Amino acid sequence: KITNPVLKGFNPDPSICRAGEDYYIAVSTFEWFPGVQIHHSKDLVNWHLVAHPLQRVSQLDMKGNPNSGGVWAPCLSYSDGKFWLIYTDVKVVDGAWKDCHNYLVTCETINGDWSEPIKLNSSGFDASLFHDTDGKKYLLNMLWDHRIDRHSFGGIVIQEYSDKEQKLIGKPKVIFEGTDRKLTEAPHLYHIGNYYYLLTAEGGTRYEHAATIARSANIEGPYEVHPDNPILTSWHDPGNPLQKCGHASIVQTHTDEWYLAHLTGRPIHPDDDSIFQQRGYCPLGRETAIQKLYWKDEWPYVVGGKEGSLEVDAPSIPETIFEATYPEVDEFEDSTLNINFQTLRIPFTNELGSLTQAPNHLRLFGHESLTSTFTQAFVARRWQSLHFEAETAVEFYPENFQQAAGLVNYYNTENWTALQVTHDEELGRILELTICDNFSFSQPLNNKIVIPREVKYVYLRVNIEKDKYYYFYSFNKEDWHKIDIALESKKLSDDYIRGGGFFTGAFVGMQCQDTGGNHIPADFRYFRYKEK
Amino acid sequence: KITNPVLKGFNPDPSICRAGEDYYIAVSTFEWFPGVQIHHSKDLVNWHLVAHPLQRVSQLDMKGNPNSGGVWAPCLSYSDGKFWLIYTDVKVVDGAWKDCHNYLVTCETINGDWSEPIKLNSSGFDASLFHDTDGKKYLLNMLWDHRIDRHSFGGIVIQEYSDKEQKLIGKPKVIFEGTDRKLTEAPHLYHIGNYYYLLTAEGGTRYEHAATIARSANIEGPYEVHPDNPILTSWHDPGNPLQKCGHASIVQTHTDEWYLAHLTGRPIHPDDDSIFQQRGYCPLGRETAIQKLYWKDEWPYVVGGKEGSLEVDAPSIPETIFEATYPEVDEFEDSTLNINFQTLRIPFTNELGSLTQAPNHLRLFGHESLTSTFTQAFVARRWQSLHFEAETAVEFYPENFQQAAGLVNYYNTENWTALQVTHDEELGRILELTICDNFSFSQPLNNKIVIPREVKYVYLRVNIEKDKYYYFYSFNKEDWHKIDIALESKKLSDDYIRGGGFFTGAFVGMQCQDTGGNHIPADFRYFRYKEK
Amino acid sequence: KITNPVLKGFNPDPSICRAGEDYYIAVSTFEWFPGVQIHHSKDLVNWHLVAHPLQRVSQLDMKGNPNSGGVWAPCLSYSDGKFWLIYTDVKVVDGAWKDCHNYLVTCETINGDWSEPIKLNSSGFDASLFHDTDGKKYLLNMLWDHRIDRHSFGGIVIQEYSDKEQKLIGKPKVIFEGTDRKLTEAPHLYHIGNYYYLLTAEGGTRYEHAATIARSANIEGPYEVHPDNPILTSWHDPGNPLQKCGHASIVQTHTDEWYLAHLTGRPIHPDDDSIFQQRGYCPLGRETAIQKLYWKDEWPYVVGGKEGSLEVDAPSIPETIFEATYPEVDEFEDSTLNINFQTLRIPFTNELGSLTQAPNHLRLFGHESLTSTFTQAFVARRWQSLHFEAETAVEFYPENFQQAAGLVNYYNTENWTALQVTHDEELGRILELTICDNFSFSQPLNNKIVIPREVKYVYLRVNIEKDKYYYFYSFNKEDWHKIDIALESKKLSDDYIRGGGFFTGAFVGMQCQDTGGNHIPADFRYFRYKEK
């Protein structure tokens, strides 16, 4: 009944919660704005993107943030008639430190105007708010240890949160130090029956990823780990469809059934290497899956095995399907950017672009290049399948070589490919392909593609076919020309990019840059996205 | 008479200009705030720091800026009864692109409140404003070419600036492409006699650095280069006291004498290598020197040779000495931070610290670590000699290992050494030494230094002795203890650090970090700096 | 009964074979001379080193061989009243190619004078001779594919060997391509019952190492893999005492019992990392272990699980213990170098040293440095425990700084530590510590240790304590002095050193170098080795 992944493409660190008969899953967004994606569902089978809480700079200011910084694992809960969202803003993703700050924002509705952030702490990421049955609230998070002679993951800390005083009270204390899997993080507390279940993620978000659970009669612990721990992991099984299974969250349906949401990666193996050595590449990044749970001796177990299955029995609730959140062909007729579209770090303002200046078009004013962590006029959407076709049409009249606009497949500032309309001093308007492979730049087209002066719209297309993708262009929307270069999809995956931050996924979108200072506009007639 | 360097320590890209009988030199400050350092002089022999124009976030927002980004070479000029300051904010310092934006701010006085920035262009750095004798103004700057098959330095461009419309008018055009020295930048135009002299810097800011000059009857050119070009360079002479001689600016005194301000580096040779292969390390970064000029056949020449001399004949103007801009021992009795003190990227606010909360103390509230490009509670000053002694006393009571405060010798987020008072779970308060060598972290003290509970102030000192420096500490201002580790000064130099940005210099200051979230205060009683 | 590892220390790629009621295991030696170590046993519990077949340059010429080159996995068999030894001489261990040559030498006795080599082929390493029940012989080996678009491991090839013509006949052909574990190598054929069992090693010699088996009615195949393959591997179990379990060989005792010899690594975890990410370091290199087998449905299985156990049931044969092959303190009274001692690449000749010139001493004439792949006067023995104490006494009178002699703990030319008596121009005789960490040299002793002129013998000792080892010295055999530097044992392990060749292990021995040309002698009075 439930077919995983439930949330395809870049949708990591799922935080599932129930509000009456409605189910929500908050996922990490990192540098993508607006921050935190929230999906909704009635039956746990069918889902749809409904909100992005962090829409204001006062809530989330990520200009200048390093790749894979910003919003890490979020925590969404429901209590006292409102939603509670705990999020982090990571400023440093490399080195001995991991400078970050945890905040809290609330809202009675999932898609309403969330409150201004309440400062919590900064001792570590993966902060989570636990609502105990006695009315008390506690904040959990991992402790980051920068000291040389100690492992960076110093354990799980807890501290009571005063709702009235809007701050953490008392003193924090370590309640769990993890198992031999180490890299203990993603703490989530649950008061079920006569025990307090502490759920954590261990082994890192790569292939050693796992979800461990422990219990204690008292909240302070010590916690005893599950007899068959980890309750979720596929490290030992490279053949399993779902990999990197960890960073989970538990939910009890209104039908008294138990499920476990968790992130996962579906890798491709294009190099023909030994899967045991080279586990694979995930262009779709880390996605969200949901496993079913069963109880035995007051211990939760994953139905079908700890590895995680693709097909899972759905709860006993009537089916509720939702309409598509995006049209196959977006004609930009609405004054609001489609919810599936996001910008880098900063909000989409009149400065970056407009949907009203040029009716039925997405106008993007040229700004900084694709290697900039500050201001990019780039509107993109996630790669939610390894078999799709994205397309757009752009009216662009560049006057200098520092002006380019087109279709761009992107992971981070150091990894991307771009097919843009630009200006050559001798040839005039040309269609150029630029590649940034882990900061290794190249413009492989020896024979530049010249664009006739009478061409109003330059049609750009990209076809993703599992391990490879190709670019196509057209001047009249009938005759398409293929750019004879088989680009590798693995180069836009979490497993390929360098750096301490590799927590996003491949994106495809419309972009315009003007490093000359003229902020030249680029008009995109439409944006098509169709999965096979 | 004039003893070079005139501006010691981190003071690169000098832009000298005359205002009546007053002389000013604006230098680059990069990530250090407030931006742009302006020095004043009457006789060109004696100088003193007088102002930092960019004090507001609206003028300069560098939060998140990469190391050596931000404020590059500035251009200070005087015309129409006011000062004109052209500055750049570089966002990207590595890769094919060098995303930056040029701005203009004015002020009738050198230390008054400068105006809000006027957007100019972004085609390249080293922007300069030229005031022609006919009342017309022109903006010069180097053209950055990101394209693979071409040099990044695409020549010198010029475009007329409309003072009335507050914007560049017409179209820009290349007027000079440089010589075989390449890396043509730092364009400065001067209308002297029957010619327009275009001064530029070539060969890069390292040891191949040079200053070239060309002339033309008309402003558009083409420009003919000096017959004995470059007019300034010591590349061919590794033994010359002044190295990296380039990025100059010309000034004509009120006594009708000509001088050439330029950046320079005074390297040390600690490794005992061949100076021809390994030219040396400059812990003091790039400093400012002034050479005397002489005319012959309508061409300027450097007096004493193009290499540059230490002793230069001063102009025929009476001597005017200035009082020290800083006390040997700063007791923090003033509510204003000494002008020689600067912070990283952001302004010094009540959030970061205070000089009023704890009278006669510099209170610093713990923030992010030394590896953060965002918010650091770090107040530092430049190393203006290779023979000095810096000292401070701090009252700190850390409760967790994520809180540390002390003395810190710093270059960038990846290169620094820190002697801080911190907390150990087993030992309590301890004095720890942390080292970040090109992002390689270490804490070499095997035997931790335990600080007794009754100790109110922990005295920290550092002695710089040319190629090496040592840390000292004390608990009662009588008995000093040496930390037996000979730290190398070369590790805090432009020539040692990795990355595309290596344009600052060594700094020494007071710091406090609290990655726990408590923003714990650290009280520094004083800050002593005494050169030998 | 059987306690693994049976062969401790550097003793990889075990090739077990039975000769009546005697059992032998041939292991790889790589650059160490004499080539191939052969151990003997009667009960499979107690073992002892008895021979090194390749003692002549005509058989093995490894002068100039790269680290971890030379003798790779050997194949020892018994048939027609004599022993057959297949060995390889690998010349290239990095890049697209792996230039090597396979040879065959025979001898009626295990420790007699083996014959001159018979050239076989060069298509790949891991050559093995199979003696079929019909009197026919076949050579097996892996196929190395250097071509870019294919895996280097091109499968298992077989070709009939003519004993009469002393050469391979007919044409070779691929009979097996392996499983998803890949890196298929170490082919061994066994004709048991109605099937031909092809045993191979897969997943590489690191932690993904495994032993796979397949069967076929006919020798040409195709071969069907074991239903629960691999039959041996501990990749999925980082907690297992035995790691890197692969490259096995099967033996049927005279008591009709089955056992499986295989290499294994016992890693230490000194960095406090996650064992799932960082599996560990093996200073003892790859050792040999023996598992018991059991048959079911004509398929062999490892008793106790595929991971491999420490305690294994011994065969039903009476216990036969052997006397120690080496004295705790070697006083060098015999004219024969102890069998446990080996030299690098070349044989121990009068040119390198002598046991007769200076009776009761091991005289070593100074030659090339420890970084030379040619001629080193270095006599060493393996580290067969992570808890031992090695000691020696040397009488050395160096006259120049290019002469040094002492105690050395070595892995390869780029990884070692040495405590040697040398000459300083100002201080005279001094004791210096030199370190080569992955080709990064350093002499960390700031205060040089001066040796008084009246000192005849300089006592040198080293204490290995699991993850760390320390050097000690003395001038009178009573008062020891500890060099305060905690050296890491992980730096002399297979998992730490760089390069394509990482197949040996840590050694400890006596050395003397004279890069001046004088070949200065160094007299070592004794060599002690005592395991805790």
CB A276 within 8 Å of CB C203: yes
With contacts defined as CB-CB under 8 Å, which chain B residues touch A375? Answer: 91
* Contact yes or no for C208 and A277 at CB 8 A: yes
Q: How far apart are CA A72 and CA A128, in angstroms?
A: 12
Q: How far apart are CA A427 and CA C519, in angstroms?
A: 72
Q: How far apart are CA B330 and CA B335, in angstroms?
A: 12
Chain C residue with Cα closest to A152: C273
Q: How far apart are CA B136 and CA C389, in angstroms?
A: 85
Q: Dump the DSSP string for A240-299.
A: SSSEEEEEEEEEE-TTS-EEEEEEEE--B--S---TTTS--B-TT-SEEEEEEEEEETTE
Looking at residue A117, the DSSP 8-state letter turns out to be P
Q: How far apart are CA A477 and CA A500, in angstroms?
A: 42
Looking at residue A187, the DSSP 8-state letter turns out to be E
Chain A: which residues have CB within 8 Å of chain B? Answer: 63-66, 91-92, 94-97, 99, 101-102, 119-123, 144-149, 368-369, 371-375, 401-402, 414, 436, 439, 441-443, 514-517
CA C375 to each of CA B214, C367, C409, C499: distance values in angstroms, whole numbers, following the listed order: 62, 7, 18, 21
CB A503 within 8 Å of CB A72: yes
Q: How far apart are CA A401 and CA A404, in angstroms?
A: 7
Question: Mapping DSSP to helix (H, G, I), strand (E, B) and coil, where does residue C499 land?
Answer: coil
Q: List CB contacts of C417: < 8 A, sequence separation 6 or more.
A: C408, C409, C410, C433, C434, C435, C436, C471, C487, C491, C492
Q: How many CA atoms lie within 13 A of C213 on its CB side?
A: 28
Q: What are phi and psi of C253, to 5 degrees?
A: -65, 170
Strands of C324-386, DSSP E: 329-330, 342-344, 353-354, 362-365, 377-382
Cis preceding linkage at A34, omega within 30: yes
Q: How many CA atoms lie within 13 A of C387 on its CB side?
A: 2
Chain B residue with Cα closest to A444: B148
Q: What is the largest CA-CA distance in chain A?
A: 78
* Contact yes or no for C276 and A236 at CB 8 A: no
CB count in 10 Å sphere of residue A89 = 24
C157-179 burial code (b ≥16 CB/10 A, e <16)? bbbbbebeeeebeeebeebbbbb
Strands of B152-309, DSSP E: 153-162, 167-168, 173-176, 185-192, 195-202, 210-216, 224-225, 232-233, 243-252, 258-265, 287-296, 299-302
Q: What are phi and psi of B203, to 5 degrees?
A: 80, 5
Residue B454 one-letter amino acid? E
List A101's β-bridge partners, or say none. Answer: A89
Alpha-carbon distance A302 to nearest alpha carbon in chain C (angstroms) = 20
Question: Mapping DSSP to helix (H, G, I), strand (E, B) and coil, where does residue B491 land?
Answer: helix
Q: Tokens for C206, please give them.
A: 């690191």
The CA-based angle C412-C417-C423, given to 5 degrees, is 120
With contacts defined as CB-CB under 8 Å, which chain A residues touch C238? Answer: 180
3-state DSSP helix/strand/coil % of chain A, to nearest 5: 0, 45, 50
Chain B: which residues have CB within 8 Å of chain A? Answer: 63-65, 91-92, 94-97, 99, 101-102, 119-123, 144-149, 368-369, 371-375, 400-402, 414, 436, 439, 441-443, 514-517
- Find the catalytic residue in A89, A145, A185, A287: A185
Q: How many CA atoms lie within 13 A of C519 on its CB side?
A: 8
So which residues of B are the catalytic ones?
13, 185
Q: What are phi and psi of B63, to 5 degrees?
A: -65, 120
Q: How far apart are CA A92 and CA B418, in angstroms?
A: 19
Q: How far apart are CA A70 and CA B299, in angstroms?
A: 56
Cis preceding linkage at B230, omega within 30: yes
Q: Which among A121, A146, A442 is the nearest to B148, CB-wise?
A: A442
Residue A205 one-letter amino acid? T
Q: What are phi and psi of B153, to 5 degrees?
A: -90, 95
CB B401 within 8 Å of CB B429: no
Q: How far apart are CA A474 and CA A452, in angstroms?
A: 11
Q: Please report, in angstroms and rounded to a whole number, the separation of the first and last CA atoms in chain A.
A: 21
Q: Which among B95, B372, B517 is the nearest to A92, CB-wise?
A: B372
The CA-based angle A180-A186-A191, given to 5 degrees, is 100
> Which secondary structure element, helix H or strand E, spans residue B394, and what is its range?
strand B387-395
List A8's β-bridge partners, or say none. Answer: none
CB A455 within 8 Å of CB A403: no
* Contact yes or no for A146 and B94 at CB 8 A: no
CB C203 within 8 Å of CB C196: no
Q: Is B8 left (phi over 0), alpha (psi -120 to 50) or beta?
A: beta
Looking at residue A54, the DSSP 8-state letter turns out to be B
Q: How far apart are CA A440 and CA A446, in angstroms?
A: 18
Q: What is the dihedral of CA B361, B362, B368, B371, to 10 degrees?
A: -120
Place of tokens 């916690």: A223
With 0-12 / 13-18 / 19 or more C-beta atoms within 10 angstroms meaning exposed / middle / buried, residue B355 is middle
Q: What are phi and psi of B256, to 5 degrees?
A: 60, 50
Q: How far apart are CA B387 and CA B266, in angstroms?
A: 13
Strands of C345-467, DSSP E: 353-354, 362-365, 377-382, 387-395, 403-412, 415-424, 428-437, 440-442, 449-450, 458-465
* Contact yes or no for A96 and B63 at CB 8 A: no
Reported resolution, Å: 1.8
CA C272 to each of CA A181, A236, C169, C459: distance values in angstroms, whole numbers, following the listed order: 11, 22, 55, 35
* Contact yes or no for A99 and B149 at CB 8 A: no
Residue C385 one-letter amino acid? S
CA B320 to each of CA B44, B47, B290, C515: distance values in angstroms, whole numbers, following the listed order: 9, 9, 17, 65
Q: Which domains does chain A have, with CATH numbers?
A: 1-325 (2.115.10.20), 326-532 (2.60.120.200)
Q: What are phi and psi of A479, to 5 degrees?
A: -85, 110
Q: Which among A181, A239, A274 is the nearest to C182, CB-wise?
A: A274
SS (H, E, C) B231-263: CEECCCCCCCCCEEEEEEEEEECCCCCEEEEEE
Alpha-carbon distance B514 to nearest alpha carbon in chain A (angstroms) = 8
Looking at residue C66, the DSSP 8-state letter turns out to be P
Q: How far apart are CA B428 and CA B450, in angstroms?
A: 7
Q: Dump the DSSP string for C107-121.
A: ESSTTS-PPPPEE--
Q: How far apart are CA A119 and CA C321, in angstroms?
A: 72
The rounded radius of gyration (Å) of the Cα atoms in chain B is: 23
* Contact yes or no for B442 and A148 at CB 8 A: yes
Q: Dump the DSSP string for B56-107.
A: STTT---TTPPTT-EE-S-EEEEETTEEEEEEEEE---SSS---EEEEEEEE
Q: How many CA atoms lie within 13 A of C244 on its CB side?
A: 24
Q: How far apart are CA C187 and CA C208, in angstroms?
A: 18
Q: Which among A148, A371, A442 is the nearest to B443, CB-wise?
A: A148
* Contact yes or no for A276 and C151 at CB 8 A: no
Q: How far apart are CA B343 and CA B376, in angstroms?
A: 8
With contacts defined as CB-CB under 8 Å, which chain A residues touch C272? Answer: 149-151
β-strands A210-216, C362-365 pairing: unpaired
Cα dihedral sign for A493, A496, A498, A502?
positive
With contacts defined as CB-CB under 8 Å, which chain C residues touch A183? Answer: 274, 277
* Contact yes or no for A274 and C239 at CB 8 A: no
Q: Tokens for C203, please give them.
A: 């997943």
* Contact yes or no for A276 and C208 at CB 8 A: yes
Nearest C-alpha neighbor of B404 from the set B294, B520, B490, B315: B520
Alpha-carbon distance A211 to nearest alpha carbon in chain C (angstroms) = 14
Q: How far apart are CA B334 and CA B355, in angstroms?
A: 8
Nearest C-alpha neighbor of A68 from the set A152, A114, A125: A125
Q: Which among C208, C239, C276 is the nearest to A274, CB-wise?
A: C208
Q: How far apart are CA B101 and CA A375, in angstroms?
A: 12
Q: How far apart are CA C247 and CA C320, in angstroms?
A: 27
Q: How many CA atoms lie within 13 A of A164 on its CB side?
A: 3
B244-253 burial code (b ≥16 CB/10 A, e <16)? bbbbbbbbeb
Experimental method: X-ray
Alpha-carbon distance B274 to nearest alpha carbon in chain A (angstroms) = 33
Nearest C-alpha neighbor of C6 from the set C233, C312, C411: C312
Catalytic residue status for C399? no
CB-defined contacts A:C, below 8 A: 50
Q: Is A31 left (phi over 0), alpha (psi -120 to 50) or beta?
A: alpha
* Contact yes or no for C181 and A274 at CB 8 A: yes
Catalytic residue status for A13? yes
CB A24 within 8 Å of CB A300: no
With 0-12 / 13-18 / 19 or more C-beta atoms within 10 angstroms meaning exposed / middle / buried, residue B333 is exposed
3-state DSSP helix/strand/coil % of chain C, to nearest 5: 0, 45, 55
Q: How far apart are CA A380 and CA B277, in angstroms?
A: 49
Q: Tokens for A132, please give them.
A: 């105990």
Q: How far apart are CA C483 and CA C473, in angstroms?
A: 8
Chain B residue with Cα closest to A95: B439
3-state DSSP helix/strand/coil % of chain B, to nearest 5: 0, 45, 50
